[PDB]
Design a protein around this ligand. Structure first.
Ligand SMILES: [Cu+2]
Length: 72
């Protein structure tokens, strides 16, 4: 496992960030998941089965604009 940062834009509320971290929690290969309305990134700890690639997509689908900014 490792951490990845998704820089995440659009979301600005508890409902959205809750919705986000909730989804990350419910993928497969996600160990930990800590979102921040301060930095406007989502930090997620993944193993292998799920990557920043899928995570990006999940996080986009939630209804916002994000990208894999960097590992951790
Ligand atoms: Cu919102």
């Amino acid at each position: 496992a490792r951490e990845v940062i998704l820089a995440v834009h659009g979301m600005t509320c508890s409902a959205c960030t809750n919705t986000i971290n909730t989804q990350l929690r419910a993928l497969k290969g996600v160990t930990k998941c800590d979102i921040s309305l301060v930095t406007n990134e989502c930090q997620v700890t993944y193993d292998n089965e799920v990557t920043a690639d899928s995570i990006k997509e999940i996080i986009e689908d939630c209804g916002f604009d994000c990208e894999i900014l960097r590992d951790s």
